[PDB]
Amino acid sequence: VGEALEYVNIGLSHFLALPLAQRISLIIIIPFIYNIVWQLLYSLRKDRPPLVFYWIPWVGSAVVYGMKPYEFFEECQKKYGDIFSFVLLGRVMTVYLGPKGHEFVFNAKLADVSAEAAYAHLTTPVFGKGVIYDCPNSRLMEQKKFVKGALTKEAFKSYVPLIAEEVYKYFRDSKNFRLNERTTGTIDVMVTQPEMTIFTASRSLLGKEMRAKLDTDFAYLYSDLDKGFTPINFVFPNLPLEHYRKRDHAQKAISGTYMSLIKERRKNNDIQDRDLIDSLMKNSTYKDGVKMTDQEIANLLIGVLMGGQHTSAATSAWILLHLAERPDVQQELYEEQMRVLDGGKKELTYDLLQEMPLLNQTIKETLRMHHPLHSLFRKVMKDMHVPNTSYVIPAGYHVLVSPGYTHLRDEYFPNAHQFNIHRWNNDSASSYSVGEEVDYGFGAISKGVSSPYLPFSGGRHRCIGEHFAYCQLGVLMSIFIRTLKWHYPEGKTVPPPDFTSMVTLPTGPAKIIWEKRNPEQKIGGRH
Numbered sequence: 001v002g003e004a005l006e007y008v009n010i011g012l013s014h015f016l017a018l019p020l021a022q023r024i025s026l027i028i029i030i031p032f033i034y035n036i037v038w039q040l041l042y043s044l045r046k047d048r049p050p051l052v053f054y055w056i057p058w059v060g061s062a063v064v065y066g067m068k069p070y071e072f073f074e075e076c077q078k079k080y081g082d083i084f085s086f087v088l089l090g091r092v093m094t095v096y097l098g099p100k101g102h103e104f105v106f107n108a109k110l111a112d113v114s115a116e117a118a119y120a121h122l123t124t125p126v127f128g129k130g131v132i133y134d135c136p137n138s139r140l141m142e143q144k145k146f147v148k149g150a151l152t153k154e155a156f157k158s159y160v161p162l163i164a165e166e167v168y169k170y171f172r173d174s175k176n177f178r179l180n181e182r183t184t185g186t187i188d189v190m191v192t193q194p195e196m197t198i199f200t201a202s203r204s205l206l207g208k209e210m211r212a213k214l215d216t217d218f219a220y221l222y223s224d225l226d227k228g229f230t231p232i233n234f235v236f237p238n239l240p241l242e243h244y245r246k247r248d249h250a251q252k253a254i255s256g257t258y259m260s261l262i263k264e265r266r267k268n269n270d271i272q273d274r275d276l277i278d279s280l281m282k283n284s285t286y287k288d289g290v291k292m293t294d295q296e297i298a299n300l301l302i303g304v305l306m307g308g309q310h311t312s313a314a315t316s317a318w319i320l321l322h323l324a325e326r327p328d329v330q331q332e333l334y335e336e337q338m339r340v341l342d343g344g345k346k347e348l349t350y351d352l353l354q355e356m357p358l359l360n361q362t363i364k365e366t367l368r369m370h371h372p373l374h375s376l377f378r379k380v381m382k383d384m385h386v387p388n389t390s391y392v393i394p395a396g397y398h399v400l401v402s403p404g405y406t407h408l409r410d411e412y413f414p415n416a417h418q419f420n421i422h423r424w425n426n427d428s429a430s431s432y433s434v435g436e437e438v439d440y441g442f443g444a445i446s447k448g449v450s451s452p453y454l455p456f457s458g459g460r461h462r463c464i465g466e467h468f469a470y471c472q473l474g475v476l477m478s479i480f481i482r483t484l485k486w487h488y489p490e491g492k493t494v495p496p497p498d499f500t501s502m503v504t505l506p507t508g509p510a511k512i513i514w515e516k517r518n519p520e521q522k523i524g525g526r527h
């Protein structure tokens with residue numbers, strides 16, 4: 001022990017007498033070996049889920065997870081069961097697959113897990129400060145409450161003809177259609193659907209002013225900001241590059257535009273019940289008296305529009321793509337449209353949308369096969385014991401839940417990779433609380449979150465956009481169906497998802513060929 005500790009000090013010193021060709025090369029090799037040693041040691045633990053073995057420190061299973069998460073989850077499930085962890089770019093993600101995982105994560109106590117600590121870097125740089133994940137959970141709960149106030153049956157009743165008008169205007173004016181001058185055409189659905197989504201959501205949620213603005217070069221800011229909404233933000237939220245400056249600039253310029261409208265309306269007391277802007281002007285005071293600022297209101301609007309943008313656009317693209325090889329479904333949907341709208345002699349209303357179950361089943365089935373968000377996260381805040389196991393998930397870990405994975409299991413949905421809207425006969429609702437309920441601040445929602453079908457999650461972070469989504473997707477598809485037939489270019493089929501984008505959007509270029517059902521029909525109005 002005497003000469004031992006001396007040779008420790010000697011050894012520390014001889015280390016520095018190494019050529020750096022050796023010293024840098026061991027600066028790499030040492031973490032690599034400890035990593036493997038720590039993993040081998042880790043596997044001993046009884047109070048830890050199996051950890052997926054990986055070679056590269058820090059990076060972890062990022063590549064295979066990133067490129068094909070559901071295949072990754074399937075392989076891990078086979079070897080280890082439903083609970084397992086894996087390292088991902090410096091973090092430890094504990095996956096819990098299936099309905100019990102949904103319960104473990106979505107109904108976890110506010111104290112145990114944090115969504116804002118998982119998500120804030122993704123969103124705060126894009127939306128702005130003070131809202132959504134840049135604030136405490138109870139602020140979020142009430143912001144969801146505020147937004148829900150513009151998402152009522154009466155609002156949907158007034159949105160439908162606005163959304164309809166936008167779809168027709170797009171058919172009339174967009175270079176991708178121009179139905180008054182073309183009877184057939186080819187389109188990339190990842191060009192047309194993001195455009196139709198932003199036009200329809202602008203007009204209805206933001207109002208005529210902000211929609212009007214999309215016909216100016218102001219539209220280039222949306223693109224700039226949109227490009228800033230990327231999973232890279234999870235790792236690099238701010239880097240001194242043109243991309244990040246374009247984004248930052250856009251967030252300032254767009255929120256400034258919203259603030260201009262807001263202050264303009266208040267100045268004239270032109271505060272009605274037209275749109276989400278009016279709504280948040282009348283109704284954005286928290287339960288402790290603090291009022292949202294005009295800046296926070298605008299940042300909230302950006303997030304809502306942005307979130308709704310990507311989930312919905314990706315979804316209507318997938319609907320288009322699945323219907324492109326299924327002329328039978330198109331036909332079936334067309335007949336439902338003729339019946340409900342009396343051969344087209346009835347105008348589409350919100351109430352009539354509700355009497356189109358096949359259409360709604362089509363949305364529902366698309367969301368089963370193409371959950372836009374394949375992985376939902378929470379950062380673990382307090383150590384968590386996994387019920388009926390010896391597993392304890394320690395603070396500093398992340399829990400990862402994936403209803404999108406369960407959506408694609410045959411055990412829960414027979415023939416899960418087949419598109420079949422009739423699996424939802426007797427069950428065309430977007431979702432519905434199968435039993436008892438609970439209120440976190442934005443309204444009574446289902447207490448249990450064990451449904452195998454769960455595109456809108458559940459618990460305190462449950463989506464509040466599902467009825468707006470169905471309204472938007474519904475009006476849009478109703479008009480697509482009554483106006484066009486479409487199919488694939490010869491030899492093409494449904495693309496595989498891109499699991500590396502923000503949403504599980506189709507892999508490009510995803511093209512379909514459209515043709516007018518009534519070549520002679522004209523869309524009125526000015527252009």
Ligand SMILES: CC[C@@H](C)n1ncn(-c2ccc(N3CCN(c4ccc(OC[C@H]5CO[C@](Cn6cncn6)(c6ccc(Cl)cc6Cl)O5)cc4)CC3)cc2)c1=O
Nearest residue numbers: 062063066119231303304306307308311375499500501502
């Ligand atoms: C680097 C190597 C490469 C191979 N690699 N290695 C890993 N990956 C990778 C891993 C994971 C992912 N992602 C995909 C995106 N994903 C994700 C995206 C958004 C998201 O949103 C959850 C919250 C926050 O945003 C919204 C989204 N939303 C919900 N409804 C509508 N939008 C949200 C909620 C509320 C509001 Cl107001 C706005 C928004 Cl945006 O909900 C959650 C997860 C995480 C995993 C991507 C790439 C790679 O690409």
Ligand code: HEM
Nearest residue numbers: 308311312315376455456457460461462463464465468469
């Ligand atoms: C196809 C359409 C959509 C799907 C599948 C979807 C899905 C989801 C999911 C899964 C979550 C929870 C994520 C988690 O648990 O971590 C969520 C949250 C949320 N979504 Fe959506 N969404 C959709 C459309 C919309 C729309 C149109 C809006 C706004 C109009 C919207 C606004 C929100 C909001 C405000 C939250 C709450 C965030 C939180 O509480 O943390 N979503 N959505």
